[PDB]
Design a protein around this ligand. Structure first.
Ligand code: NDP
Length: 308
């Protein structure tokens, strides 16, 4: 499939362009991706600090004749804005940056409220209680008011998800999570599956930090299939049945990364890829949420409700 259909009925393209740490070429990258490479999904977030430039990319893409209706734009509401009263202004800011009337998916970026002026790593009192029910309620009002087509969560746990599901009038459309060989998070996937929640794999290449493009297991499959490591990694996600948001700021790799249709990874190789031990986790949240001295989160384990 080149798309998924969310519970709302809206289609989401299976492959999107990640824009975190996209840098100076951000706007060019978004435009190339959409016009030249045929991407119809861009993943971004306020905290990446690139939405303005992404809005410029999307603008030139729509000036090139791509209908708004055919684009899927994701953004994320940052922790600092995870208070009911701040949900709407954050979105409105995001929409101004992105030069859009609406976005297709708005995620809870991380399920943790941060104090204004919070530091990395957080100081005492800077990590606050997330009023998930109250914040989600305003996330729902975004959809009611046509500003967001679907709402989602990133970086959840099963615990947090069950909590959200007991309250949500509109369940999250999409759960976006770090997934890649060496960090499958089948635990969250199976909980999303059970609840009919679609899953996006972020950092599908291992991000830069645990990039898997040079991993011998990935290289081995890639050589046999005559695909680039990145292609194999992106295909692996699709074969798991997640959407997938590979990031590159290089036009060649932008194009490379969506040449993931009309072939498959043999199940034997898919299985080798899956058998890479889950322990290659890039985003623990430690530097965002963990104060070991004062808490409330003393370790990554606390961040992830000890689920992984
Ligand atoms: N909800 C959330 O908390 C998060 C969401 N995400 C989203 O997911 C996206 C993707 O994850 P991210 O961690 O950015 O990175 P990816 O897993 O997509 O990998 C990006 C890294 O791999 C390189 N790369 C890109 N294409 C190839 C290629 N085919 N072959 C070899 N190397 C390649 C990139 O370099 P180069 O640019 O030079 O090509 C960069 O170093 C993010 O951009 C963001 O949109 C990411 C982190 C957290």
């Amino acid at each position: 499939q080149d798309h998924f259909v969310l519970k709302s009925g809206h289609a989401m393209p299976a492959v999107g362009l990640g824009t975190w740490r996209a840098g100076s070429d951000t706007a060019h990258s978004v435009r190339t991706a959409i016009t030249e490479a045929g991407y119809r999904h861009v993943d971004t977030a306020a905290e990446y600090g690139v939405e303005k430039e992404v809005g410029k990319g999307l603008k030139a893409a729509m000036e090139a004749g791509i209908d708004r209706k055919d684009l899927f734009v994701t953004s994320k509401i940052w922790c600092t804005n995870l208070a009911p009263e701040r949900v709407r202004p954050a979105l409105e800011n995001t929409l101004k940056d992105l030069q859009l009337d609406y976005i297709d998916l708005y995620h809870i970026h991380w399920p943790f409220r941060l104090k204004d002026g919070a530091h990395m790593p957080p100081e005492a009192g800077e990590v606050l209680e997330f009023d998930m029910e109250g914040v989600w309620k305003e996330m729902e009002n975004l959809v009611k008011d046509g500003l967001v087509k679907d709402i989602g969560v990133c970086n959840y746990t099963v615990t947090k998800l069950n909590r959200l599901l007991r309250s949500a009038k509109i369940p999250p459309a999409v759960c976006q999570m770090e997934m890649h060989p060496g960090w499958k998070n089948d635990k969250i996937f199976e909980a999303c599956k059970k609840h009919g929640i679609h899953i996006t794999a972020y950092s599908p290449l291992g991000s830069s930090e645990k990039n898997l493009a040079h991993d011998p297991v990935v290289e081995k499959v890639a050589n046999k299939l005559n695909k680039t490591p990145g292609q194999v990694l992106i295909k692996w996600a699709l074969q798991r049945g997640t959407s997938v948001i590979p990031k590159s700021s290089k036009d060649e790799r932008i194009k490379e990364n969506i040449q993931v249709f009309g072939w498959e990874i043999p199940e034997e190789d898919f299985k080798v890829l899956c058998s890479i031990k889950d322990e290659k986790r890039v985003l623990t949240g430690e530097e965002l949420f963990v104060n070991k001295t004062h808490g409330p989160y003393r370790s990554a384990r606390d961040v992830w409700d000890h689920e992984n």
